[PDB]
Scaffold this motif. Structure first.
Motif, PDB file in Angstrom:
ATOM      1  N   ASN A   1       0.205   9.002   2.089  1.00  0.00           N
ATOM      2  CA  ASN A   1       0.780   8.318   0.906  1.00  0.00           C
ATOM      3  C   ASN A   1       2.247   7.921   1.078  1.00  0.00           C
ATOM      4  OD1 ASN A   1      -1.539   8.592  -0.993  1.00  0.00           O
ATOM      5  ND2 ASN A   1      -1.112  10.782  -0.802  1.00  0.00           N
ATOM      6  N   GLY A   2       2.655   6.830   0.429  1.00  0.00           N
ATOM      7  CA  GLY A   2       4.068   6.422   0.393  1.00  0.00           C
ATOM      8  C   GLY A   2       4.608   6.042   1.755  1.00  0.00           C
TER       9      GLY A   2
ATOM     10  N   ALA B   1       1.981   6.337   4.361  1.00  0.00           N
ATOM     11  CA  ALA B   1       1.024   5.230   4.460  1.00  0.00           C
ATOM     12  C   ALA B   1       1.540   4.232   5.462  1.00  0.00           C
ATOM     13  CB  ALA B   1       0.805   4.561   3.107  1.00  0.00           C
TER      14      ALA B   1
ATOM     15  N   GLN C   1       7.892  -2.191   4.200  1.00  0.00           N
ATOM     16  CA  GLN C   1       6.980  -1.688   3.181  1.00  0.00           C
ATOM     17  C   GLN C   1       7.472  -0.331   2.632  1.00  0.00           C
ATOM     18  OE1 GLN C   1       2.654  -2.111   4.336  1.00  0.00           O
ATOM     19  NE2 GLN C   1       2.546   0.006   3.620  1.00  0.00           N
TER      20      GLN C   1
ATOM     21  N   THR D   1       0.792  -1.218   0.000  1.00  0.00           N
ATOM     22  CA  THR D   1       0.000   0.000   0.000  1.00  0.00           C
ATOM     23  C   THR D   1       0.837   1.286   0.000  1.00  0.00           C
ATOM     24  OG1 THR D   1      -0.258  -0.073   2.416  1.00  0.00           O
ATOM     25  CG2 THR D   1      -1.970  -1.158   1.087  1.00  0.00           C
ATOM     26  N   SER D   2       2.056   1.228   0.533  1.00  0.00           N
ATOM     27  CA  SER D   2       2.991   2.339   0.384  1.00  0.00           C
ATOM     28  C   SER D   2       3.283   2.536  -1.089  1.00  0.00           C
ATOM     29  CB  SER D   2       4.299   2.105   1.150  1.00  0.00           C
ATOM     30  OG  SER D   2       4.109   2.256   2.544  1.00  0.00           O
ATOM     31  N   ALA D   3       3.509   1.432  -1.807  1.00  0.00           N
ATOM     32  CA  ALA D   3       3.807   1.493  -3.242  1.00  0.00           C
ATOM     33  C   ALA D   3       2.623   2.006  -4.046  1.00  0.00           C
ATOM     34  CB  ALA D   3       4.232   0.125  -3.773  1.00  0.00           C
ATOM     35  N   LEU D   4       1.441   1.451  -3.779  1.00  0.00           N
ATOM     36  CA  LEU D   4       0.234   1.882  -4.480  1.00  0.00           C
ATOM     37  C   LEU D   4      -0.025   3.372  -4.237  1.00  0.00           C
ATOM     38  CD1 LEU D   4      -2.319  -1.072  -3.773  1.00  0.00           C
ATOM     39  CD2 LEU D   4      -0.973  -0.706  -5.859  1.00  0.00           C
ATOM     40  N   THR D   5       0.123   3.830  -2.993  1.00  0.00           N
ATOM     41  CA  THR D   5      -0.178   5.227  -2.685  1.00  0.00           C
ATOM     42  C   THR D   5       0.918   6.177  -3.181  1.00  0.00           C
ATOM     43  OG1 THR D   5       0.622   5.080  -0.368  1.00  0.00           O
ATOM     44  CG2 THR D   5      -1.767   4.781  -0.768  1.00  0.00           C
ATOM     45  N   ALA D   6       2.190   5.785  -3.090  1.00  0.00           N
ATOM     46  CA  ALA D   6       3.281   6.605  -3.642  1.00  0.00           C
ATOM     47  C   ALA D   6       3.086   6.828  -5.135  1.00  0.00           C
ATOM     48  CB  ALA D   6       4.624   5.957  -3.386  1.00  0.00           C
ATOM     49  N   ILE D   7       2.852   5.743  -5.869  1.00  0.00           N
ATOM     50  CA  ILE D   7       2.655   5.807  -7.315  1.00  0.00           C
ATOM     51  C   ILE D   7       1.336   6.498  -7.655  1.00  0.00           C
ATOM     52  CG2 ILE D   7       2.349   4.476  -9.455  1.00  0.00           C
ATOM     53  CD1 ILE D   7       4.189   2.316  -8.053  1.00  0.00           C
ATOM     54  N   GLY D   8       0.257   6.110  -6.995  1.00  0.00           N
ATOM     55  CA  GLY D   8      -1.037   6.805  -7.154  1.00  0.00           C
ATOM     56  C   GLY D   8      -0.959   8.318  -6.987  1.00  0.00           C
TER      57      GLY D   8
ATOM     58  N   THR E   1      -5.252   3.156   4.941  1.00  0.00           N
ATOM     59  CA  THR E   1      -4.297   2.888   3.870  1.00  0.00           C
ATOM     60  C   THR E   1      -3.990   1.397   3.713  1.00  0.00           C
ATOM     61  OG1 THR E   1      -2.449   3.238   5.431  1.00  0.00           O
ATOM     62  CG2 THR E   1      -3.189   5.146   4.182  1.00  0.00           C
TER      63      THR E   1
ATOM     64  N   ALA F   1       8.888   0.372  -1.280  1.00  0.00           N
ATOM     65  CA  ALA F   1       8.177   1.362  -2.093  1.00  0.00           C
ATOM     66  C   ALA F   1       9.101   2.437  -2.671  1.00  0.00           C
ATOM     67  CB  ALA F   1       7.053   2.005  -1.288  1.00  0.00           C
TER      68      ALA F   1
ATOM     69  N   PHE G   1      -8.242   8.483  -7.844  1.00  0.00           N
ATOM     70  CA  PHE G   1      -7.323   8.336  -6.713  1.00  0.00           C
ATOM     71  C   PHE G   1      -7.516   9.366  -5.588  1.00  0.00           C
ATOM     72  CE2 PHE G   1      -3.116   8.512  -4.571  1.00  0.00           C
ATOM     73  CZ  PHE G   1      -3.111   7.214  -4.080  1.00  0.00           C
TER      74      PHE G   1
END
Ligand SMILES: [Zn+2]
Ligand SMILES: [Zn+2]
Ligand SMILES: [Zn+2]
Ligand SMILES: [Zn+2]
Lengths: 181, 184, 184, 184
Positions: free
Chosen positions: C50-51, C54, D58, A77-84, C75, D62, C90
């Motif tokens: 985010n990131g 999160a 995580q 979810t860090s990846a999804l939210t960073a990219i998002g 998240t 990321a 998003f």
């Protein structure tokens, strides 16, 4: 009536599987043969989708690792939210394909309409990497079905309703897993 | 052959759904009614389970929150699962989150294909301790979970031996319940 | 040289914390006090970001749930994140979960290293519309988020340009808040 | 006093980093060099840990993917819950190392005490698979520190409190990522 509503859900789910059984047997065997070819040559299987199809991606990956090389791209979810946030939602799976994917791996893309923009990008990214693609789609297969190659395998559930499409996908996934072992 | 194997999975899954249809229609209504009563009294619904059932729990929650309804999957916070697993033991990963989030009148949806999952059993105990009702999605004979239930709880046992077919029916039951809720 | 580069990171991180020490003690206390008031009135805390933020949101929530306190990171549910991102867009991934779970008196902790995260901004709106108080963890000048806060909210701005240094101060701030809650 | 407690938290965090700054520079550099050697030979990096250290695994992954081959083993909750339930919680990371790990890859195991059983199993599975290991530990390094080889790299934060160890780990992670970025 809620009793009739529920009963109508059961009946429709039986009609969709009966309709699906007659067309999806051969493709499912081709999908499992593709995964065995990938796994027997030190490859791995990446999986992705949105919503209930994201749940189906991690379900499948858990059947394999519980050991066989399979990673859901819907879990970090860090990846999804960073990219998002920075690049935009269309790129959340493709960037992970570009990160992890290598020649001879398989992408399992899941999209009930066959038009999920982020699954479309992931398929594009898989092709640039010389990976094979297995698309779990519904309705007419959408843009995803049109963009596949002869070396890819299409698993299209022909029913318009999303709930019915998801139910067939989990069954397709259990059939593939059982074929593989 | 591989063809016959896949063919048999489809046929087994059709049969499982035909048999499930004969006994699960009235209980599925009870469960959906139980969630409507909870959501209309400003309650929320907590979902949990393991493996494919963990995927089912968050599938359910996403269709509720996606007007917006109060549902949380207890199988998603990986800092919580691993912290509780490492420190207190894996059997307490759901029960501890029920104690954090649960309130009188809320509903626990507990998902176990065998009815014997230690962590879902502890979560049932916790949910009872806080005056919550329980919708148990089980398989086989219903296991220990079915034996624990109070008369105010609703049991949805899929009468089948194989896990894969039980998971398939659980996702159908979830879609049926969500649509009954939408209908009101 | 890699040795000098690593040394520089430590020195920069020390410098960053010495400055935040001068101006974030009183606000951090206000933020913790607000969370104690909310919890003692049977409320809950929602966290989002985010990131790296999160990760911070689920870290915060995991230390609350491990007695057990009402805190949910928004998240973690990947079916909800991917459903809302795909279907709506998003920028509504946090604001829709706030509309699902939030009630009057609850607390949103929005984490954003620039204060300009579109999905964290939309979450602040939804929290305001639900009569929830907000605790913003921001960096740099605080961005649009700092501009957006009511009198009853608490801004924890890390006055530093670099994202990495802001995240590192954020987790310190979280730890200091959790320990203040523990002490009561 | 809440002000004093928060003040003490800032002061202790600055003291811990000053202590850490004077031993971890050379090891951090060797960890970055190990990762670069893995990546440049088409390898990938796996990360794991519990609680806040799962958040850190995580976080790390990321920043590599957004592109570099890195996967956290803490994120698939279906896999964690199946393995916890069916095989036991000690095997949740190691089973995934067995599934994904290939000779020449790197495991990042994160543990504040050095005594996390599932991280110990991950380390063991990594050595049987000819993988190198970066252990992020604290206190005295625990069982994990004794377990490492010449070809591995220990990153031990010498401080007793868990919050201070975590804060330093995220700094170390940021230092490693910036070292790797500077070389490419
Ligand atoms: Zn669905
Ligand atoms: Zn399954
Ligand atoms: Zn970071
Ligand atoms: Zn912590």
């Amino acid at each position: 009536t809620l009793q009739e509503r529920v009963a109508a859900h059961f009946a429709e789910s039986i009609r969709a599987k009966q309709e699906a059984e007659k067309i999806l047997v051969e493709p499912t065997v081709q999908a499992a043969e593709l995964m065995l070819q990938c796994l027997m040559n030190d490859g791995k299987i990446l999986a992705c989708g949105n919503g209930g199809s994201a749940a189906d991606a991690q379900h499948f990956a858990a059947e394999m690792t519980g050991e066989l090389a399979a990673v859901a791209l819907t879990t970090d979810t860090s990846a999804l939210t960073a990219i998002g946030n920075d690049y935009g939602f269309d790129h959340v799976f493709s960037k992970q394909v570009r990160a992890l994917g290598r020649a001879g791996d398989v992408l399992v893309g899941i999209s009930t309409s066959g038009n999920s923009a982020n699954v479309i990008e992931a398929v594009k990214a898989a092709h640039e990497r010389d990976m094979h693609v297995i698309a779990l789609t519904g309705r007419d297969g959408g843009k995803i079905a049109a963009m596949l190659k002869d070396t890819d395998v299409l698993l299209n559930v022909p029913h318009p309703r999303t709930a019915r499409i998801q139910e067939n996908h989990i069954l397709l996934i259990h059939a593939m897993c059982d074929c593989i072992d």
